[PDB]
């Protein structure tokens, strides 16, 4: 016999005896009714607008418009799904000591979860249909859920049970979440005033910067393009035109409007920073919002193998985190959102790199339109050098902007790494982790060595490439005079100058990769011999062992890229030096 609130003894917990809204299953029953109200309003409306249309009839090609606070509503919805599945887990772990299936711990949270997913689906369907005359159902739903959540919370506080029980802090997070949902609801009321008082989509097939945040994360709009990829292949026709912000000449309107306000390579640097620092710090703030979600891996591992090494009815928060099933589920969700945020950081960094290239190619063209031909004729630059500058140096700038937020978020990741290393292992973590700060100045040493090697190599490659250009152009002279052997000998002289630089470059890169590997494994050797010897034997469990090992692994996993990053930034430095050299050249009066 299944029963709401269960049938423990005489159904004695069904009583209203001390007053209305004084039973916990009663305020759970009041918590039930806004969810089923939302389902029973939404499902006929969601049925009659969409899905009621038949198979032949197809709707609504483009040009939706997002409501204000749409980002905040989706982020609050995602943390709502997280806290509701945590509530479902609390309901499952609650009825472990008691029998006869207390349904008041499951079914409020379950109907809340169904109401949450149907509310966000109804919001998406009314968002792409842009009809604000609806969504007052969402307004009255958020008020109703907020009122019954305040009722349950102040009845938690009336009985004075809190802050160690998961239900209390759970309900507190849920009621401040519902307050934020009512805030974004009345913000949709306040601006875009519709109740009590477009963006250009003509030919565009990109759709990425103006779409709902889940499909911003999952790139779900391109699922249609990959569906049409197993068809006729895609062309520049039906690739669409550019979005206006990511159009060329719009950047470089931004860049010349940063340059005239700038009033030189360092001036180019600082005004490029003024031009694209907003998107760059958005890139790096996605990057540091990631890898702190990455700093839940080792904590979850320590939790699961720390448990595995061993006011009516309640689940305490420490016993909830003692249970390792929910820690595994938390690790799964944390790694899910961590990979999502890392991919988003990658995308917006590559987008601002593409925009950087689209601006500075136009600036190179504006300089080449006013360049005096005296510079081309007398020495310092050739046509091969200019096209070399574009087709290599612009990509060097673009790859440096691909890998800029990684080096911005490197020090933050390693400092939170070493502080969480101090959270376990005691003081010996510092004597095991000082090897990284010991090998940090030799990164600067090999950076200088790599720098001079690359400085030689770019000059030599310019020499060899223009020599190959004149040889391949004057092939007809070269063969008919039979001078190709001595010309190939001169080319091999320049190639020996290449190889004598690339040999030292390769040796120094191998030096840095030897520095890049086995310093973490040297760190775990140092801290593990120095933990079991010369130190007090302070809890060498499997727990802190594998937590420290996974933490060192996740510390050195972003260390192992740094050689390509320092090669890229030195190539970008000599690149922008040659760029500011070319942009400061003579002109036509």
């Amino acid at each position: 016999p299944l029963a709401f609130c269960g049938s423990e003894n005489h159904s004695a917990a069904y009583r209203v005896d001390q007053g209305v809204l004084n039973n916990g299953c009663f305020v759970d029953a009041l918590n039930v009714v806004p969810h089923v109200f939302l389902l029973f309003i939404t499902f006929p409306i969601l049925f009659i607008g969409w899905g009621s249309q038949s198979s032949k009839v197809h709707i609504h090609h483009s040009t939706w418009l997002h409501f204000p606070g749409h980002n905040l509503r989706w982020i609050l919805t995602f943390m709502l799904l997280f806290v509701l599945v945590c509530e479902i887990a609390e309901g499952i772990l609650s009825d472990g000591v008691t029998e006869s299936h207390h349904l008041h711990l499951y079914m409020p949270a379950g109907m809340a979860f169904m109401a949450a997913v149907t509310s966000v689906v109804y919001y998406h369907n009314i968002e792409t249909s842009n009809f604000p005359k609806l969504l007052i159902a969402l307004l009255v739903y958020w008020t109703l859920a907020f009122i019954t959540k305040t009722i349950k919370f102040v009845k938690f506080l009336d009985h004075a049970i809190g802050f160690s029980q998961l239900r209390f802090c759970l309900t507190g997070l849920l009621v401040i979440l519902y307050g934020m949902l009512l805030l974004v609801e009345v913000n949709v009321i306040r601006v875009r005033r519709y109740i009590f008082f477009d963006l250009q989509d003509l030919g565009v097939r990109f759709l990425q910067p103006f779409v709902n945040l889940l499909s911003k994360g999952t790139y779900w709009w391109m699922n249609a393009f990959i569906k049409t990829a197993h068809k006729k292949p895609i062309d520049l026709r039906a690739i669409g035109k550019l979005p206006i912000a990511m159009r060329a000449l719009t950047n470089y309107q931004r860049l010349c409007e940063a340059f005239d306000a700038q009033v030189g390579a360092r001036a180019i640097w600082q005004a490029l920073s003024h031009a694209f620092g907003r998107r760059l710090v958005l890139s790096s703030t996605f990057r540091i919002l990631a890898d702190l979600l990455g700093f839940a891996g080792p904590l979850c591992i320590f939790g699961i193998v720390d448990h595995l090494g061993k006011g009516v009815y309640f689940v305490s928060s420490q016993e909830f985190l003692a249970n390792a099933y929910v820690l595994a589920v938390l690790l799964f969700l944390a790694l899910l959102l961590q990979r999502t945020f890392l991919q988003a950081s990658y995308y917006v960094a590559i987008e601002t790199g593409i925009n950087l290239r689209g601006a500075i190619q136009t600036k190179i063209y504006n300089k080449i339109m006013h360049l005096s031909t005296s510079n081309l004729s007398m020495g310092e630059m050739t046509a091969g050098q200019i096209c070399n500058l574009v087709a290599i140096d612009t990509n060097q700038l673009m790859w440096f902007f691909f890998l800029c937020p990684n080096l911005w978020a490197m020090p933050v990741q390693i400092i939170v790494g070493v502080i969480l290393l101090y959270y376990i292992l005691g003081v010996s973590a510092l004597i095991g982790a000082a090897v990284i700060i010991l090998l940090a100045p030799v990164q600067y040493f090999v950076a200088t060595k790599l720098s001079q090697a690359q400085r030689s190599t770019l000059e030599y490659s310019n020499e060899r490439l223009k020599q190959t250009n004149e040889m391949l152009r004057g092939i007809k002279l070269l063969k008919l005079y039979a001078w190709e052997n001595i010309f190939r000998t001169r080319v091999e002289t320049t190639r020996r100058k290449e190889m004598t630089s690339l040999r030292a470059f390769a040796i120094y890169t191998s030096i840095s990769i030897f520095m890049n590997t086995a310093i973490p494994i040297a760190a775990v050797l140092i801290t593990f011999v120095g933990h079991v010897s010369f130190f007090k034997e302070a809890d060498f469990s499997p727990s802190v062992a594998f937590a420290s090992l996974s933490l060192f692994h996740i510390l050195v996993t972003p260390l192992f890229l740094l050689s390509s990053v320092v090669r890229s930034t030195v190539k970008a430095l000599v690149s922008v030096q040659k760029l500011s050299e070319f942009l400061s050249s003579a002109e036509i009066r």
Binding site: V16, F26, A29, I48, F131
Partner: protein, 321 residues
């Protein structure tokens, strides 16, 4: 190659990329009646089960709020008698809304909230009853299903009558019912250009049906010959006999309007004719016989036609003798 409307009467259109869906939303009723049969059954049972379960949850919440769900009782009446489970409250909401009233579960005058929720449950129960039963009777009473009983020829024919080339086809009833004020609309749908360069994909120009007065209105009892004479201003004036082939930009649609005599509600039967469906130089056989003081018609040989000596050229050159 692609016909406009089917031979059965189904329009082969797509309606791609409709922009405004709010005007779809602002009439839910025509979308409600215009569904498939399992979808209408599903929304019928969905609406009734949704109302019953919602008021079930309301009655169970009332019986929990008064505390009579706890069987530890004194002598006071519950707001609803003999409810001690959610399922019993569901059965009570069943007895209330569809108005059965067994009385083992019945309402006492203790809770005024129970009286109020009974009032609103009865009001929207009567409302949902009126809506759903009228909607399902209008669904079963629409008369596009009557158009299934009005036959046409497979082949329209072109032959001679009164010295003029006419375009004939046969259409008959299958009941002893009537089609009250049965009108005929015959439209030539094809792609044509204007002399001024205006190009239109489907120009629905309509030939007039030759009646005798000119009002396109027939009396369908026997399957009669309806026919349009090809005049000079008719769009069939320059039609070759060799033009009647496949991949020929020509379609003749015949739209029979009227109202069903039995139900009194109106209807429309439609059919198409392509170029390779039209027979040239042929006429229909007589299918009406008279015996036993009545008239007999053989629908088994309804579609048959004979060959007729006919000039093998267009109606334009027929006017030059």
């Amino acid at each position: 190659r692609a016909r406009f409307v089917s031979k059965k009467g189904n329009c082969n259109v797509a309606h791609k990329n409709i922009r405004e869906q709010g005007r779809f939303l602002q009439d839910v009723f025509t979308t409600l009646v215009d569904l498939k049969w399992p979808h209408t059954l599903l929304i019928f049972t969905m609406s009734f089960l949704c109302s019953w379960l919602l008021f079930a949850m309301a009655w169970w919440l009332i019986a929990f709020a008064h505390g009579d769900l706890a069987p530890s009782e004194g002598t006071a009446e519950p707001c609803v008698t003999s409810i001690h489970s959610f399922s019993s409250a569901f059965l009570f909401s069943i007895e209330v809304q569809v108005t059965i009233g067994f009385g083992g579960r019945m309402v006492t005058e203790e809770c005024p909230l129970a009286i109020l929720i009974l009032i609103v449950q009865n009001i929207v129960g009567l409302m949902i009853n009126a809506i759903m039963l009228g909607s399902i009777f209008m669904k079963t009473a629409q008369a596009h299903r009557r158009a299934e009983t009005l036959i046409f020829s497979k082949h329209a024919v072109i032959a001679l009558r009164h010295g003029r080339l006419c375009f004939m086809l046969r259409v008959g009833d299958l009941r002893k019912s009537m089609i009250i004020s049965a009108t005929i609309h015959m439209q030539v749908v094809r792609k044509t250009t204007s002399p001024e360069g205006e190009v239109v994909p489907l120009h629905q120009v309509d030939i007039p049906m030759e009646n005798g007065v000119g009002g396109n209105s027939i009396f369908l009892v026997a399957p009669l010959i309806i026919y349009h004479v090809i005049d000079a201003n008719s769009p069939l004036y320059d039609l070759a006999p060799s033009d009647l082939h496949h991949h020929q930009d020509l379609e003749i649609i015949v739209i029979l309007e009227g109202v069903v005599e039995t139900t009194g509600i109106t209807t429309q039967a439609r059919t198409s004719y392509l170029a390779d469906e039209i027979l040239w130089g042929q006429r229909f056989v007589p299918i009406v016989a008279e015996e036993d003081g009545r008239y007999s018609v053989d629908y088994s040989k309804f579609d048959n036609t004979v060959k007729v000596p006919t000039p093998l050229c267009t109606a334009r050159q027929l006017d030059e003798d």
